Amino acid sequence: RTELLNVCMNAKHHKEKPGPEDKLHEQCRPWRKNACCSTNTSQEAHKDVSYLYRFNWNHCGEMAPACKRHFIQDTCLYECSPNLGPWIQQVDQSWRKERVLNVPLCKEDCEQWWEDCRTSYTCKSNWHKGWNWTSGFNKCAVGAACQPFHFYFPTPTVLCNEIWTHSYKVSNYSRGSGRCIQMWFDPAQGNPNEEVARFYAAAMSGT
Numbered sequence: 471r472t473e474l475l476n477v478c479m480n481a482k483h484h485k486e487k488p489g490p491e492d493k494l495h496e497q498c499r500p501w502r503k504n505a506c507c508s509t510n511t512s513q514e515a516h517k518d519v520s521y522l523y524r525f526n527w528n529h530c531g532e533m534a535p536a537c538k539r540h541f542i543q544d545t546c547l548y549e550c551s552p553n554l555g556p557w558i559q560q561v562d563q564s565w566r567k568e569r570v571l572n573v574p575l576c577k578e579d580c581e582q583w584w585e586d587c588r589t590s591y592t593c594k595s596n597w598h599k600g601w602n603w604t605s606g607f608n609k610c611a612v613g614a615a616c617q618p619f620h621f622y623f624p625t626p627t628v629l630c631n632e633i634w635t636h637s638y639k640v641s642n643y644s645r646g647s648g649r650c651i652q653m654w655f656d657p658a659q660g661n662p663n664e665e666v667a668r669f670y671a672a673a674m675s676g677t
């Protein structure tokens with residue numbers, strides 16, 4: 471890994487190399503110029519128990535739309551962003567050889583995600599391991615564990631860092647600081663993560 475810019479991690483759905491995709495579905499639209507995901511992936515990203523991982527958002531009842539939109543974006547960012555190389559790492563697991571860790575998610579992005587999920591429910595603080603997939607999709611391990619979202623995710627930082635086993639590491643930097651990754655951004659103003667990756671790919675460059 472000498473070049474961590476404009477590259478795609480090696481996961482279950484990513485393409486081998488970045489490339490235009492003017493057919494990406496709604497939320498994944500900001501990545502039409504250059505994406506790591508396919509038209510199909512972006513489409514499935516907006517569906518419940520998608521073809522991607524059969525993940526069920528409604529494990530503790532229907533998750534509020536205002537909250538699911540944040541999980542859909544995360545899917546877009548994770549499955550389409552070509553600016554995550556500075557955080558790519560090899561884990562070697564049944565479904566993905568590589569993945570991202572400690573991505574510096576902007577302070578706001580994490581606080582907004584957290585906020586919009588207050589009215590939602592969940593039974594775990596780690597959505598990567600622990601589910602009961604017997605039914606074909608994940609269901610609560612301990613069915614009686616359902617509680618308000620903030621019960622398992624007390625603070626924004628706990629939600630963004632823990633939920634996806636540390637794929638994120640909420641930064642103190644805010645949107646626009648050029649030092650943090652944004653999962654929400656207006657493509658008409660440009661992709662702000664290009665500059666961020668470049669910055670970090672340099673801080674770890676050389677030695």
Ligand SMILES: Nc1nc(=O)c2nc(CNc3ccc(C(=O)N[C@@H](CCC(=O)O)C(=O)O)cc3)cnc2[nH]1
Pocket residue numbers: 523525544545548563564565569597598599600601602603634637638
């Ligand atoms: N930012 C971000 N980072 C991620 O790592 C990420 N991962 C997913 C994929 N989520 C998941 C989580 C768990 C399982 C799952 O099947 N868990 C099983 C087996 C896990 C394994 O074998 O490694 C389980 O333990 O219950 C599948 C997809 C979606 N969005 C992400 N978004």
Ligand SMILES: *[C@@H]1O[C@H](CO)[C@@H](O)[C@H](O)[C@H]1NC(C)=O
Pocket residue numbers: 510511513514521
């Ligand atoms: C994405 O591709 C899979 C695999 O062929 C297919 O089952 C699924 O229906 C496709 N998504 C859409 C929305 O067509």
Ligand SMILES: *[C@@H]1O[C@H](CO)[C@@H](O)[C@H](O)[C@H]1NC(C)=O
Pocket residue numbers: 601602604605611612
């Ligand atoms: C998983 O769910 C099934 C029901 O489909 C149940 O019989 C089994 O005891 C559960 N096991 C776990 C991991 O809690």
Ligand SMILES: *[C@@H]1O[C@H](CO)[C@@H](O)[C@H](O)[C@H]1NC(C)=O
Pocket residue numbers: 641642643
């Ligand atoms: C938090 O961000 C500040 C600048 O906003 C930086 O000085 C610091 O290294 C970061 N980490 C912590 C834990 O303060």
